[PDB]
mmCIF file as gemmi writes it, N, C-alpha and C atoms, coordinates in Angstrom:
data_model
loop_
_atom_site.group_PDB
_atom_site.id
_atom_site.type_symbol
_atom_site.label_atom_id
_atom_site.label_alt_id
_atom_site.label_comp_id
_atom_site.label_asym_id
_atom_site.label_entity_id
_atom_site.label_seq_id
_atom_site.pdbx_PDB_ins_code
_atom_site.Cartn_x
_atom_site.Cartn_y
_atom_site.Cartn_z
_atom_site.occupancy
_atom_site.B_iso_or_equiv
_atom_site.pdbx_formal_charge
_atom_site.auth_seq_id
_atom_site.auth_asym_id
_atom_site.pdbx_PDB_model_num
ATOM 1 N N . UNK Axp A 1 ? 89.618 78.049 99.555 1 0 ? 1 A 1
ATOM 2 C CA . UNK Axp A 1 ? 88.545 78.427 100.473 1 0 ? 1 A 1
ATOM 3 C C . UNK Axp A 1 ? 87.489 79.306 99.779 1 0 ? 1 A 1
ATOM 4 N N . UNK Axp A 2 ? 86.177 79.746 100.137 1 0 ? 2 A 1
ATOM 5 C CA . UNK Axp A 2 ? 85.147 80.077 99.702 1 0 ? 2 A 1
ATOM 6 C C . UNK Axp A 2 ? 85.545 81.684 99.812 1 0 ? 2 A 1
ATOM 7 N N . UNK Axp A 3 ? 85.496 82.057 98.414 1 0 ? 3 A 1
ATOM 8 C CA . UNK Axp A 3 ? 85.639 83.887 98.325 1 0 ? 3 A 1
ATOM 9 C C . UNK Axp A 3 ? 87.5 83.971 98.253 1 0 ? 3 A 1
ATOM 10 N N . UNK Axp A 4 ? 87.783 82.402 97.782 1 0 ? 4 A 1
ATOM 11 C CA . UNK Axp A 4 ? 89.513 82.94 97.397 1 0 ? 4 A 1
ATOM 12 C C . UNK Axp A 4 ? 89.66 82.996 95.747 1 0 ? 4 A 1
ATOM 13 N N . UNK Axp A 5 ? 90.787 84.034 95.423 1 0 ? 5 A 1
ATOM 14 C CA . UNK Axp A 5 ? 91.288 84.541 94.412 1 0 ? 5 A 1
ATOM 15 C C . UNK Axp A 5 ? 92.772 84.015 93.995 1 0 ? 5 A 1
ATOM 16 N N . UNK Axp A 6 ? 92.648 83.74 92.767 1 0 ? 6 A 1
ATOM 17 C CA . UNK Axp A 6 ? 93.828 82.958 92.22 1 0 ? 6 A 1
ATOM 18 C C . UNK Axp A 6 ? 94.209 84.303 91.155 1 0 ? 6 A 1
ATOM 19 N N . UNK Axp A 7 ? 95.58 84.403 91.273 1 0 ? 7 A 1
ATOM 20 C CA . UNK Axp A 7 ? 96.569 85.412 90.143 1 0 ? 7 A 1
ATOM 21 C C . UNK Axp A 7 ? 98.019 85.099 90.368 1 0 ? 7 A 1
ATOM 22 N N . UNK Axp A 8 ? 98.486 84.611 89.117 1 0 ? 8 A 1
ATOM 23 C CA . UNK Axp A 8 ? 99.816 84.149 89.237 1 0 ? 8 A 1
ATOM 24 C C . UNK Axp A 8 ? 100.286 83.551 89.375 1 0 ? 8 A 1
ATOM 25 N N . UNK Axp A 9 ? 99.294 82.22 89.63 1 0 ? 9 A 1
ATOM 26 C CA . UNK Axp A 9 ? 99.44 80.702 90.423 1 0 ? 9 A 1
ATOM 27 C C . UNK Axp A 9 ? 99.249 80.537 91.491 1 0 ? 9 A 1
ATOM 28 N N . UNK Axp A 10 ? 99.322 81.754 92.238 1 0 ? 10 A 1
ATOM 29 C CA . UNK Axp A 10 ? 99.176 82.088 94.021 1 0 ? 10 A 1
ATOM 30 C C . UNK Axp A 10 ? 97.546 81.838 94.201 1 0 ? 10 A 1
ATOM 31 N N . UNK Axp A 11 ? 96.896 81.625 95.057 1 0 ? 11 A 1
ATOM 32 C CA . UNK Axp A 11 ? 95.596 81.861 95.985 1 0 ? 11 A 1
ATOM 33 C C . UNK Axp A 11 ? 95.597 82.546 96.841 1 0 ? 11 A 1
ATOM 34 N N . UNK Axp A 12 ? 94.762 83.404 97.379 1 0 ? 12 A 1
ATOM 35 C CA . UNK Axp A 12 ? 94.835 84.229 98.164 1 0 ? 12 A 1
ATOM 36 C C . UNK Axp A 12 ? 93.228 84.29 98.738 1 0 ? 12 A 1
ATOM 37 N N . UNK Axp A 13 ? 93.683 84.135 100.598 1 0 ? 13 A 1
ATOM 38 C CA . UNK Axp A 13 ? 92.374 83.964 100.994 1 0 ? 13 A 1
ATOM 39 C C . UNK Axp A 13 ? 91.429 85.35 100.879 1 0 ? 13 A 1
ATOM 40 N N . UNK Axp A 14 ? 90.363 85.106 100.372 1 0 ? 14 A 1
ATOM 41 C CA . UNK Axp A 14 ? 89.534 86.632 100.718 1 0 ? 14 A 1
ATOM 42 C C . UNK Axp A 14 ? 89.829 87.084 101.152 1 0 ? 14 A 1
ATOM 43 N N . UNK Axp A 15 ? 89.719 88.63 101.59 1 0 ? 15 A 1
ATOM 44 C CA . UNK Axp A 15 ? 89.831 90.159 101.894 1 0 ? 15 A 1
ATOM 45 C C . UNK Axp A 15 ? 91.287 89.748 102.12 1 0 ? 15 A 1
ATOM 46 N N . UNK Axp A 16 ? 92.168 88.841 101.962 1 0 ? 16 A 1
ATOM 47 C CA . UNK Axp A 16 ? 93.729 89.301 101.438 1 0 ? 16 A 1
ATOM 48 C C . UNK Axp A 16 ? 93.99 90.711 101.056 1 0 ? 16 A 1
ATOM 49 N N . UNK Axp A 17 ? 95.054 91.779 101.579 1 0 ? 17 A 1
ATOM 50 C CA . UNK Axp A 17 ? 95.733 92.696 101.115 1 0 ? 17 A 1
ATOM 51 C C . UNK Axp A 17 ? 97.096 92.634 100.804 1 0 ? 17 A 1
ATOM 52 N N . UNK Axp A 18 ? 97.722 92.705 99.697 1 0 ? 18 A 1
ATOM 53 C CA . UNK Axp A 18 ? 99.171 92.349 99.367 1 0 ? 18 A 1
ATOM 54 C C . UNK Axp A 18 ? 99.753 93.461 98.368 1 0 ? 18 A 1
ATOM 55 N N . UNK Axp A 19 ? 101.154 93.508 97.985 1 0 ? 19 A 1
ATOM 56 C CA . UNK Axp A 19 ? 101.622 94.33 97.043 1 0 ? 19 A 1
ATOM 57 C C . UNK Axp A 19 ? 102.474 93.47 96.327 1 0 ? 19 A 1
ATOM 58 N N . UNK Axp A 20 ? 102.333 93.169 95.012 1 0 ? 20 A 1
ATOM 59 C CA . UNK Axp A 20 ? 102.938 92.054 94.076 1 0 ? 20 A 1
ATOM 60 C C . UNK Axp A 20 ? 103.766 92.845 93.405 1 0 ? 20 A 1
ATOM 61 N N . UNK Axp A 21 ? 104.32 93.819 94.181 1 0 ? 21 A 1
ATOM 62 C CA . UNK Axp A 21 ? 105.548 95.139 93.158 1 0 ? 21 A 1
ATOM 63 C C . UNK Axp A 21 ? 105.083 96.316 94.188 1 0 ? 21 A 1
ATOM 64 N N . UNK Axp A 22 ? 105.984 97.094 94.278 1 0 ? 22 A 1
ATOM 65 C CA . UNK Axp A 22 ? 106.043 98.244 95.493 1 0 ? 22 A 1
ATOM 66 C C . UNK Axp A 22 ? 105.24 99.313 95.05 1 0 ? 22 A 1
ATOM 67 N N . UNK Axp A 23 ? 104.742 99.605 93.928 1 0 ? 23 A 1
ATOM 68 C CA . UNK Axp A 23 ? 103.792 100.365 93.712 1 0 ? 23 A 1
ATOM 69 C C . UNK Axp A 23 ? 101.847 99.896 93.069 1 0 ? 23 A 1
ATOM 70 N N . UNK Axp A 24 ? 102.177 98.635 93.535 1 0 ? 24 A 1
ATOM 71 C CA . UNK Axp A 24 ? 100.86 98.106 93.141 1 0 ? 24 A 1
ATOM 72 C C . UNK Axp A 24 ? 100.246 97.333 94.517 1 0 ? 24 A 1
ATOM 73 N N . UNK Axp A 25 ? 99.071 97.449 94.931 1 0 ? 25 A 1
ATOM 74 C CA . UNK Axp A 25 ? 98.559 97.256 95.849 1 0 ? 25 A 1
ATOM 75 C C . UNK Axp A 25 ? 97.037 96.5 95.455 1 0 ? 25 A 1
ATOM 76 N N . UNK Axp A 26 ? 96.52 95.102 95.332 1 0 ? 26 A 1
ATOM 77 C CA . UNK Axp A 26 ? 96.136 94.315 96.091 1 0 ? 26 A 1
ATOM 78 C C . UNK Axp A 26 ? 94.796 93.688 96.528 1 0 ? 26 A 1
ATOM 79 N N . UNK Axp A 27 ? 93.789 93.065 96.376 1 0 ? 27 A 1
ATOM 80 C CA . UNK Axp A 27 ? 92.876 92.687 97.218 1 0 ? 27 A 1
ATOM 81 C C . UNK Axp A 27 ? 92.199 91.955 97.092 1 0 ? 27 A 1
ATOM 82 N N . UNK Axp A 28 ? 91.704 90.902 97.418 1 0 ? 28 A 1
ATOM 83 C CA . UNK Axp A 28 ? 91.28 89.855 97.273 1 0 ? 28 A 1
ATOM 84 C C . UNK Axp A 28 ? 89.434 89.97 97.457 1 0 ? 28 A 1
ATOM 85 N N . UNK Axp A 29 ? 88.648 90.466 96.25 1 0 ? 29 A 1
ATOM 86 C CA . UNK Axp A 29 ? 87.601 90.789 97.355 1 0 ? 29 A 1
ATOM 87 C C . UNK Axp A 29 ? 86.561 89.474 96.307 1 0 ? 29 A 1
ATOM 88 N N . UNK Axp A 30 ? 85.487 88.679 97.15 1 0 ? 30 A 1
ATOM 89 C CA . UNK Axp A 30 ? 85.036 87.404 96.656 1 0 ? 30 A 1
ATOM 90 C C . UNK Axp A 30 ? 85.423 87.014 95.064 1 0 ? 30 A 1
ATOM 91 N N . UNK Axp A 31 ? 86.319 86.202 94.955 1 0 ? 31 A 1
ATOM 92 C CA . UNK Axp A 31 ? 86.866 85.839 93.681 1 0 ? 31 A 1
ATOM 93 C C . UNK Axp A 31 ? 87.439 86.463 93.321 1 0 ? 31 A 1
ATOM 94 N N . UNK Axp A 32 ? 87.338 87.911 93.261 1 0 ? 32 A 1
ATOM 95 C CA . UNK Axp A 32 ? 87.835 88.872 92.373 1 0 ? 32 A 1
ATOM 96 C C . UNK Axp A 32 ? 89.517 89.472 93.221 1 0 ? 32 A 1
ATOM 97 N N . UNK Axp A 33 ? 90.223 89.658 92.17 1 0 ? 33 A 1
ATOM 98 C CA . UNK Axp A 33 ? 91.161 90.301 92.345 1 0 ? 33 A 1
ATOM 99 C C . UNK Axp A 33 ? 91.109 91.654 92.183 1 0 ? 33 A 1
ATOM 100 N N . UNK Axp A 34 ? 91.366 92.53 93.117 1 0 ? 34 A 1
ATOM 101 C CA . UNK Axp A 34 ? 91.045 94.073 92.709 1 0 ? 34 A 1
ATOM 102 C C . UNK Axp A 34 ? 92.628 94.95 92.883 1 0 ? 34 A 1
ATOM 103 N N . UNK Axp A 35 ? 93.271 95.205 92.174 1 0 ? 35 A 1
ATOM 104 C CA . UNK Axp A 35 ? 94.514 96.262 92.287 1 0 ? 35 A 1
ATOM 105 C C . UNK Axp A 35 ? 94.792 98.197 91.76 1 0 ? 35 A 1
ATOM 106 N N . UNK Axp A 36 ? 94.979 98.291 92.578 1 0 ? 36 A 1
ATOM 107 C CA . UNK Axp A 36 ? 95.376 99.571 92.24 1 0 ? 36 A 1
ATOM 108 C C . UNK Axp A 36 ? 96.96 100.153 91.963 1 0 ? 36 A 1
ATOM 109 N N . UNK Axp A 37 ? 97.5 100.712 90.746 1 0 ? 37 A 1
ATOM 110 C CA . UNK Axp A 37 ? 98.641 101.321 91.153 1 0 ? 37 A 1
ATOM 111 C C . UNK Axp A 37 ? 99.249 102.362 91.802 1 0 ? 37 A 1
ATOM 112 N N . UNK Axp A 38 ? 100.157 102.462 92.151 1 0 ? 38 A 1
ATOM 113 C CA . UNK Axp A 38 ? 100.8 103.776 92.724 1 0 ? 38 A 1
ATOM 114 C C . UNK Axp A 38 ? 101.206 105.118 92.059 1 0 ? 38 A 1
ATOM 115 N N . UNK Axp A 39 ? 100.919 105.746 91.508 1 0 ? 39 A 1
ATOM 116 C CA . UNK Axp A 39 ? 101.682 107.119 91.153 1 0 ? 39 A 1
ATOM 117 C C . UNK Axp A 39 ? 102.3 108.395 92.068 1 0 ? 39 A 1
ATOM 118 N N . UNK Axp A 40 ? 103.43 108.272 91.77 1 0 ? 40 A 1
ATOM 119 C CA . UNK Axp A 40 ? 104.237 109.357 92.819 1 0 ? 40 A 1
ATOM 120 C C . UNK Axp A 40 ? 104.044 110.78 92.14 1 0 ? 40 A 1
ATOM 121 N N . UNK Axp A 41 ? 103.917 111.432 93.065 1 0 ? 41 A 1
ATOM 122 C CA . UNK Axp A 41 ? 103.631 112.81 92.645 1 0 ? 41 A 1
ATOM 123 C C . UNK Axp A 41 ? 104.716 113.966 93.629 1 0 ? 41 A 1
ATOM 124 N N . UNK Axp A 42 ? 105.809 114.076 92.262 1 0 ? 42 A 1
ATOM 125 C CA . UNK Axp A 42 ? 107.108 114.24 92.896 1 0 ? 42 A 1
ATOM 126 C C . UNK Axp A 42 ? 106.83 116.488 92.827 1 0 ? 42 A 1
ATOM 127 N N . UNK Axp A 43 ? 106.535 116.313 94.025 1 0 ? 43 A 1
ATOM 128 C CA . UNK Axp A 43 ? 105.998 118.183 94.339 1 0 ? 43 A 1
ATOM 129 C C . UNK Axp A 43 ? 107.229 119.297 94.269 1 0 ? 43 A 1
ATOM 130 N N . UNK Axp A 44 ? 108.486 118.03 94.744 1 0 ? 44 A 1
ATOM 131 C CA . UNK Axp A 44 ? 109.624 119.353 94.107 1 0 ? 44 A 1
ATOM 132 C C . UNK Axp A 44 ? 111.355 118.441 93.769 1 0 ? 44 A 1
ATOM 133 N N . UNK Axp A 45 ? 111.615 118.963 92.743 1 0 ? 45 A 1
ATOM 134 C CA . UNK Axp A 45 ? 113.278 118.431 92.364 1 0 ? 45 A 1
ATOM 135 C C . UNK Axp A 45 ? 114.271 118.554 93.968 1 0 ? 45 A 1
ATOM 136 N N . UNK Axp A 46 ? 114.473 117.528 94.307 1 0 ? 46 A 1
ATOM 137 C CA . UNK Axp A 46 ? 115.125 117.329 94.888 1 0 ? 46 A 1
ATOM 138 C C . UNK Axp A 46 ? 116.939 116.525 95.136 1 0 ? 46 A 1
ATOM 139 N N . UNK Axp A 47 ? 117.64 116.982 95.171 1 0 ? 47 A 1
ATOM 140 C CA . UNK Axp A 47 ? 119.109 116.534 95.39 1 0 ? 47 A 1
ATOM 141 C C . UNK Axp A 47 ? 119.449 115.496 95.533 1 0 ? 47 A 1
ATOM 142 N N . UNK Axp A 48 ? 119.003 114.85 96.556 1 0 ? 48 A 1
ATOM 143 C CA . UNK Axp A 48 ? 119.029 113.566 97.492 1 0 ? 48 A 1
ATOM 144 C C . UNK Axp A 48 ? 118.082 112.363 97.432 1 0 ? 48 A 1
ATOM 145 N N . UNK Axp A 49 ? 117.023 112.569 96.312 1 0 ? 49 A 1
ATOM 146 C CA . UNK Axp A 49 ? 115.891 111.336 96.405 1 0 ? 49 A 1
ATOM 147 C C . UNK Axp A 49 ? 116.263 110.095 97.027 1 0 ? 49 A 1
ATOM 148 N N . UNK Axp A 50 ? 115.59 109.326 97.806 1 0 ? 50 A 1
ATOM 149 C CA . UNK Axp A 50 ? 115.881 108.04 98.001 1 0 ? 50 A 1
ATOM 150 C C . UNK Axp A 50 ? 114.707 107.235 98.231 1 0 ? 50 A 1
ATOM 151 N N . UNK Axp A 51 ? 114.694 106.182 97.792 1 0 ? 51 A 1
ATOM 152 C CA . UNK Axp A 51 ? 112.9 105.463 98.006 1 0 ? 51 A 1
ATOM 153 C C . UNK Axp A 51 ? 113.66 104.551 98.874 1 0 ? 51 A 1
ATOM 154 N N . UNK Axp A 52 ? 112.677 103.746 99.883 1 0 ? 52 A 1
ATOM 155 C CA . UNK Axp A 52 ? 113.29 103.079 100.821 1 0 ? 52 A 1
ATOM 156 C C . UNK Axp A 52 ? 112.584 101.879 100.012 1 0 ? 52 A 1
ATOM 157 N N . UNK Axp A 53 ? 113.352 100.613 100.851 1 0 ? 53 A 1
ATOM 158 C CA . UNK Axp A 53 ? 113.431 99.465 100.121 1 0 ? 53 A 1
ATOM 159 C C . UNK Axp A 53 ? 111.608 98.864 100.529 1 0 ? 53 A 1
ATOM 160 N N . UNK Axp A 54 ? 111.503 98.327 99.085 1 0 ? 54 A 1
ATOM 161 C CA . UNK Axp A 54 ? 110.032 97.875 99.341 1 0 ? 54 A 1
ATOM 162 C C . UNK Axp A 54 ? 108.7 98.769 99.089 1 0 ? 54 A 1
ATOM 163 N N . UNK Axp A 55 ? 109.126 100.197 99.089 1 0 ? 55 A 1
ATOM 164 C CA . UNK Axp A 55 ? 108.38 101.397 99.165 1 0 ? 55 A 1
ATOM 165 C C . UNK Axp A 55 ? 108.343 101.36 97.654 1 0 ? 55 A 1
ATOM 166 N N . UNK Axp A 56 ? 107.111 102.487 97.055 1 0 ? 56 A 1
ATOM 167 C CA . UNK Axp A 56 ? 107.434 102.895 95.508 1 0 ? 56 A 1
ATOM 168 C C . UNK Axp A 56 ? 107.96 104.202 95.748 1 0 ? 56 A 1
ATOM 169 N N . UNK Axp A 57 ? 108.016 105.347 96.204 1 0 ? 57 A 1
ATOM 170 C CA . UNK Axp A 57 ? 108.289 106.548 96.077 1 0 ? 57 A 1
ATOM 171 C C . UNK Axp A 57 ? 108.896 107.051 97.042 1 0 ? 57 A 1
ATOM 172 N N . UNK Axp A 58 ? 109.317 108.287 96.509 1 0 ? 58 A 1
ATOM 173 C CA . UNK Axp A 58 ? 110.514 108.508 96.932 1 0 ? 58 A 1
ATOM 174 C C . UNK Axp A 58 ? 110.476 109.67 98.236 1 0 ? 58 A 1
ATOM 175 N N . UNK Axp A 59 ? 111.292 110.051 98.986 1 0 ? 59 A 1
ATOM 176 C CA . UNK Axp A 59 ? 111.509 110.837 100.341 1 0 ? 59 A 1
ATOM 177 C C . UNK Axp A 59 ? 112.996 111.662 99.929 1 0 ? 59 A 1
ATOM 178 N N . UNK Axp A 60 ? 112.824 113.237 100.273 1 0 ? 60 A 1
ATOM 179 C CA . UNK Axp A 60 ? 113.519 114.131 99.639 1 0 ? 60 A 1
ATOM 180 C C . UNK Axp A 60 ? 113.698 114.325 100.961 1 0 ? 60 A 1
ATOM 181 N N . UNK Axp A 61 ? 115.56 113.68 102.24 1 0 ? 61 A 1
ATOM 182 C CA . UNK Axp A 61 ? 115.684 114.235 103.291 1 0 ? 61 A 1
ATOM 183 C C . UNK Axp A 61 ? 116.119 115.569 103.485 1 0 ? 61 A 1
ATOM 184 N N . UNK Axp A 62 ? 115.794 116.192 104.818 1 0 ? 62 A 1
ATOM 185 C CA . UNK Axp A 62 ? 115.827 117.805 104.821 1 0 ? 62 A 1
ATOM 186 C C . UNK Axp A 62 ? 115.993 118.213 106.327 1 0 ? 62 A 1
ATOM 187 N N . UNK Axp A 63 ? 117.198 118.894 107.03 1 0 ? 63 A 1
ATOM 188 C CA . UNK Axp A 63 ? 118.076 118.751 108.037 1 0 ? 63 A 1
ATOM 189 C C . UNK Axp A 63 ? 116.92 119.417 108.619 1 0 ? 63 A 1
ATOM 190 N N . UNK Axp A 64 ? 117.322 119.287 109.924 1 0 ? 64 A 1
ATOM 191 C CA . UNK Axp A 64 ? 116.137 120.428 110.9 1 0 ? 64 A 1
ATOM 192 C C . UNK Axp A 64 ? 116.073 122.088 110.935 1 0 ? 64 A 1
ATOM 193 N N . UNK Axp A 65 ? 117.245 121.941 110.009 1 0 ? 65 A 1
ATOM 194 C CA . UNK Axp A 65 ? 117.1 123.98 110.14 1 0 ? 65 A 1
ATOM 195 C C . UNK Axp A 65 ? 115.966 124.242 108.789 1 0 ? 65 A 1
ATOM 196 N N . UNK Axp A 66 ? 115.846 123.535 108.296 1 0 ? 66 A 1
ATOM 197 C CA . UNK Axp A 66 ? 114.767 123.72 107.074 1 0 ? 66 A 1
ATOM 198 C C . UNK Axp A 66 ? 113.494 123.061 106.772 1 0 ? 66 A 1
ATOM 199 N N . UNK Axp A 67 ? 113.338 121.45 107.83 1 0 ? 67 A 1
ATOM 200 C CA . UNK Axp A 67 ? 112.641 120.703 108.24 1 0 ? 67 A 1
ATOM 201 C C . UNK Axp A 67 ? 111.575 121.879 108.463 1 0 ? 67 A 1
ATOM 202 N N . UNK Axp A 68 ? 110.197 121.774 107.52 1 0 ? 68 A 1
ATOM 203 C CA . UNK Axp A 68 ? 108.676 122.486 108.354 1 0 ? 68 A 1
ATOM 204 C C . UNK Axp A 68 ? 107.826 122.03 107.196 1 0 ? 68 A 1
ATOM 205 N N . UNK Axp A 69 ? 106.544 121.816 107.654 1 0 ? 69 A 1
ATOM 206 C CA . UNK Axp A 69 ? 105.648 121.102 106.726 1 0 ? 69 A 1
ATOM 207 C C . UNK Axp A 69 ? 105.022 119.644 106.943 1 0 ? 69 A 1
């Protein structure tokens, strides 16, 4: 279609938004493929890291007696 973008073998209709890896994000803007990556910016060492599936970065859980912010 008119203003679609080919990467990877895929096509993708214009203003398409996608993530081809959980920290890379996406866009289809006339012909052009435009992506940005993700960088996590990990603010404190945490015990428990866990990234949820599909996500790039990570979530440091924290019970409600200490939960603020």
């Amino acid at each position: 279609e008119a203003g679609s973008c080919v990467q990877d073998g895929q096509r993708y209709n214009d203003k398409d938004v996608w993530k081809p890896e959980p920290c890379r994000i996406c866009v289809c803007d006339t012909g052009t493929v435009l992506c940005d990556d993700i960088i996590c910016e990990d603010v404190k060492d945490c015990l428990s890291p866990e990234i949820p599936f599909g996500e790039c970065c990570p979530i440091c859980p924290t019970d409600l007696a200490t939960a603020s912010g």
